[PDB]
């Protein structure tokens, strides 16, 4: 079952999306640590749980959470940078490790939230099977900052399926991942209560990430259309991801003159998995919608093997996804902190229409040298 801990809470509670949270107390091994309420409630909080209570650590502190050693787990860390016991939140710098994996280092939640124009954030990780029955989560105030403290508002550990296998360049089954982005392309926001697999992932509409002048056209499956998952685990992504899409639209000439373009800020010197979710719910035949996919200006799917969703799936309403790996560094145009995803029709093989489509997108950072931490953004 899920372990969803509100750090510093004094009693169990439920949030706005029906998620049950328990106090952290029984899992925190380090004694005599401060628990404190936030003394300001940002209007953008969707709930006071778990955000209005925190732990404050002025020395290292360790949680020990029981887990099954053979299972992958999602780990979520919830941060609400605000005022706690009168401390300056800008003085908080710390690291977080999950066993031997560094998740965060020199982390400033305040600077990160300021750069995002957010009041709180969640950092989500997928941890490979550990072969240990305890997950140790260690918070370490920065020893480079005399005034540093660590803080944490909530910690979740959720067992999850082995949803990762390989990526078009690589094996990702044993990778430890950070979730960078999770989008329901062309569709509505999906709260965790509506996610598949009991995974309580949030899927966000993709419009804020579109950087082409043309926003394309959004598509929705017919009423009572059924997604026919077949061998794809339903936990991969919920049906509303596949029942909605962004396409370029009905005007093939406009489409051939543009790329549909999404842009994402990420950390340099990592490889990322771009998981593109697809489901054709309008067309019925191969070679009707055939498109090129570019990632950071390089062909991910194109030339003589362009993307054709029905080519991949064999049928209307059958979902799929394709994983593409991209290494991001400064030996690149535009500074090494971005991923661009672009689509445009292919002229290869004389398709019936000239269009492109995407139904969902997830971007995951792969661990390097047992680290996933990047720098704080510019404020
Ligand atoms: C911990 O994180 C903080 C906050 O991200 C780091 O401080 C920031 O460090 C960056 C460099 O990565 C500073 O930017 C640089 O500033 C100088 C002077 O203006 C400029 O010459 C550079 O071109 C660059 O822009 C940034 O200003 C700085 N922020 C603050 C508030 O000082 C810090 O270095 C990290 N590590 C440690 C151990 O403190
Ligand atoms: C769609 O996007 C692709 C990928 O960014 C464009 O092709 C690139 O164009 C840039 C800038 O001229 C070049 O640096 C890359 O070498 C090109 N990549 C490839 C694989 O050709 C493509 O021309 C764009 N199409 C439209 C219609 O804008
Ligand atoms: C990225 O890698 C380069 C080359 O090793 C290094 O010089 C640079 O400091 C790295 N940047 C970050 C943010 O780690
Ligand atoms: C991709 O091409 C565009 C258009 O020429 C350019 O502005 C951008 O810097 C290029 N990006 C990369 C990552 O090379
Ligand atoms: Ca809390
Ligand atoms: Ca969708």
Author numbering: 28 to 196, 204 to 413
Provide text from the study.
Members of the plant-specific Catharanthus roseus receptor kinase 1-like (CrRLK1L) family are key players in monitoring the cell-wall status and regulating cell expansion. Loss of FER function impairs pollen-tube reception, whereas ANX1/2, together with BUPS1/2, helps to maintain pollen-tube integrity during polarized tip growth, assuring fertilization. The structures of ANX1 and ANX2 reveal an un­expected novel fold with the two malectin-like domains packed against each other and connected by a short β-hairpin linker, forming a potential ligand-binding cleft.
We determined the structure of ANX1 via single isomorphous replacement using a platinum derivative. ANX2 crystallized in space group C2, and the structure was solved by molecular replacement using the ANX1 structure as a search model. The structures of ANX1 and ANX2 were refined to 1.48 and 1.1 Å resolution, respectively, with residues 26–411 in ANX1 and 28–411 in ANX2 being well defined in electron density. In our hands, the ANX2 receptor crystallized in a different crystal form and diffracted to 1.1 Å resolution. Comparison of the ANX2 structures resulted in an r.m.s.d. value of 0.5 Å over 377 corresponding Cα atoms. We located three and four well defined N-glycans in our high-resolution ANX1 and ANX2 structures, respectively. The glycosyl­ation pattern is conserved among ANX1 and ANX2, which harbours an additional site located at Asn331. Taken together, while the ANX1/2 malectin-like domains share extensive structural homology with both animal and bacterial carbohydrate-binding modules, the surface areas normally used to mediate the interaction with carbohydrate ligands appear not to be present in ANX1/2.
